[PDB]
Design a protein around this ligand. Structure first.
Ligand SMILES: O=C(O)[C@@H]1CCCN(c2nc3ccccc3n3cccc23)C1
Ligand SMILES: O=C(O)[C@@H]1CCCN(c2nc3ccccc3n3cccc23)C1
Ligand SMILES: [Zn+2]
Ligand SMILES: [Zn+2]
Lengths: 352, 353
């Protein structure tokens, strides 16, 4: 059936912003490189570095040309984790043995003291850029840089641990039938990350698991075939389906911006649902470009099924339901369901 | 005739337990050496490389003999020797190894002597172990450890360089159609290694030779176009079994004819290099179906014979370096191996009986 041409028109429109996203990224890289070189001089942040994560390095940044999000990794001594209240994603951080001694509150690493020093040094080194404290986000992102005219950068601190992944991830990352058990094992040997994030008042000394570096690797190396999307015979529509899924939600959220019905929904929900769609459809032949219309339709349908059943487990932490009623109320999911179904039934007028 | 090739593969597995037990004994001795070496200021950054046929799962000979590479992280400047493409003098830009300098170049002889002396002193404190200075191998391997009753291990020292690969590698590693250009670029961001190896003029004694054994392992242990190659019944291929059979056939021919020197210069590295070229020429997993093992091995043998007849076998990473040059292997050797392999193939490999 006709319709995919409208999806292609949207993908063409998104490509027009590539050069403006590239020139603003080059300015961000300049400020960020200078920030890190000054941060490494502090004894607590000597092991600081740049994590090459986010939609920009995944080549799926499809809105906000002057809004970037960057992660600063910090290598830590051997970390011991203590799960917080069976949340499977939030942990207290302890140490087996230390430059971060000043930030201990008892025996746990205080996220409050780490953010305070992080925000203080950044404000001191920024002193054509200004700094803004990022509030109402639980600590991640911590700050927002304002660079030159209208460029903003959200900066997130992330502890790096080279230890085995926590037990709560043992059944996650179900890529064996898609990218192979060998790749799974190699991914699980990479470090994992922890960002400061309070858990709901709130417990303010918790850290949350982050696998943004794994998400980027899978997105940029997404086929069963190693030569997927490298020649005309092996072009797939995986990345374009993710792009359109993120664009659909962003255009809907802009459409209903004044009311908070879609406030709790995030590009991470679409990203997580997409990874599960890839697990359920591991063969490259199921993602052929001539079926771009079909594939996007099945992606929308899968995300619709997640909202109706109120189930969307974290791809890495299967016991963590991103769609739990403690996080997103039923009426919000029903509202998003109705609007997406309307769009799908009318060839997506949001894309006009 | 493919059933006899399967019989060989079956009988090769009987030695897996003996290989594993000896490998564990080697590891314990090797770990004691690395701890002693890391105490010296010149070798503070020494580490184990984990390469060779054991870690590639294609070890087919000498269950009690192993090859081990100690890597040493070094910012070096390379100066190619006599346009050889593979042999280099090592200089430094802008130093823990300054005791091994002779003028501006890093001396392989001076570094090997200190390497041998530390290992020899750390071995005298380990029971049922002795060390031998390896001769006539040009410095690599440097020593041979004797362990317990019949275990021996060759130890090679290797400088690690995290800089860009040398220009002689620019058009090597032609895996784009097989393992993808994305993987090729990832492999080339890894370090390269240099082993001490004298060059024939070996008459020039301060050269180092490029080594990519870590890259050969990655390819062999991740060999399919499909990431799930050999991970399920639908995607079982015969690539590694073909390599094992090629290695076994050459080794068996060398041992059968060791009373003469006709085959002394041939090495398993020649078979492995030809195999990588076979993989480049046949990139699809479908061309390596396990039901066609007899045909696949026959085509591998055929390709190796063609290299022998044409006297052409480029180093897989350095395409201008011909391993089958007349400066390295006499035409008489190639002719004798050709005739022997042809006779074997014609009568269903009686060498395996
Ligand atoms: O990891 C991050 O911080 C990324 C940037 C912020 C958004 N995001 C999320 N990651 C989560 C990781 C574990 C549990 C819940 C998560 N979650 C719930 C809503 C949004 C997220 C992705
Ligand atoms: O590199 C080593 O030392 C490995 C262990 C010894 C065997 N070998 C060879 N590598 C070479 C690398 C560049 C040029 C010629 C090479 N060559 C010629 C005959 C055998 C080799 C592999
Ligand atoms: Zn693709
Ligand atoms: Zn295979």
């Amino acid at each position: 059936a006709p319709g995919a041409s409208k999806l292609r028109a949207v993908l063409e429109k998104l490509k027009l912003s590539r050069d403006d996203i590239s020139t603003a990224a080059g300015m961000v890289k300049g400020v960020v490189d200078h920030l890190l070189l000054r941060l490494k001089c502090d004894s607590a942040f000597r092991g600081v570095g740049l994590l090459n994560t986010g939609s920009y390095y995944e080549h799926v940044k499809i809105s906000a040309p002057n809004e970037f999000d960057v992660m600063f990794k910090l290598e830590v001594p051997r970390i011991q984790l203590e799960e917080y209240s069976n949340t499977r994603a939030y942990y207290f951080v302890k140490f087996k043995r230390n430059p971060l001694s000043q930030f201990l509150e008892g025996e746990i690493l205080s996220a409050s003291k780490m953010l305070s020093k992080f925000r203080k040094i950044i404000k001191e080194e920024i002193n054509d850029t200004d700094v803004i404290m990022k509030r109402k986000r639980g600590g991640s992102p911590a700050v927002t840089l304002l660079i030159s005219e209208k460029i903003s950068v959200d900066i997130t601190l992330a502890l790096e641990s080279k230890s085995s992944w926590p037990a709560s991830t043992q059944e996650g990352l179900r890529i064996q039938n898609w990218l192979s058990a060998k790749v799974r094992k190699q991914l699980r040997l990479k470090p994992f990350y922890l960002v400061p994030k309070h858990a709901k008042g709130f417990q303010e000394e918790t850290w949350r698991l982050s696998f943004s570096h794994i998400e980027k690797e899978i997105l940029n190396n997404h086929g069963k075939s190693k030569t997927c999307c490298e020649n005309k015979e092996e072009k797939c529509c995986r990345k374009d389906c993710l792009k359109l899924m993120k664009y659909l939600l962003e255009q809907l959220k802009e459409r209903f911006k004044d009311k908070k019905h879609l406030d709790k929904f995030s590009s991470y929900h679409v990203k997580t649902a997409f990874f599960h769609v890839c697990t359920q459809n591991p063969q490259d032949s199921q993602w052929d470009r001539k079926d771009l219309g079909l594939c996007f339709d099945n992606c929308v349908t899968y995300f619709l099924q997640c909202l109706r059943t109120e189930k969307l487990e974290n791809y890495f932490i299967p016991e963590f339901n991103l769609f739990s009623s403690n996080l997103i109320d039923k009426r919000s999911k029903e509202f998003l369901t109705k609007q997406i179904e309307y769009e799908r039934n009318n060839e997506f007028p949001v894309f006009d």
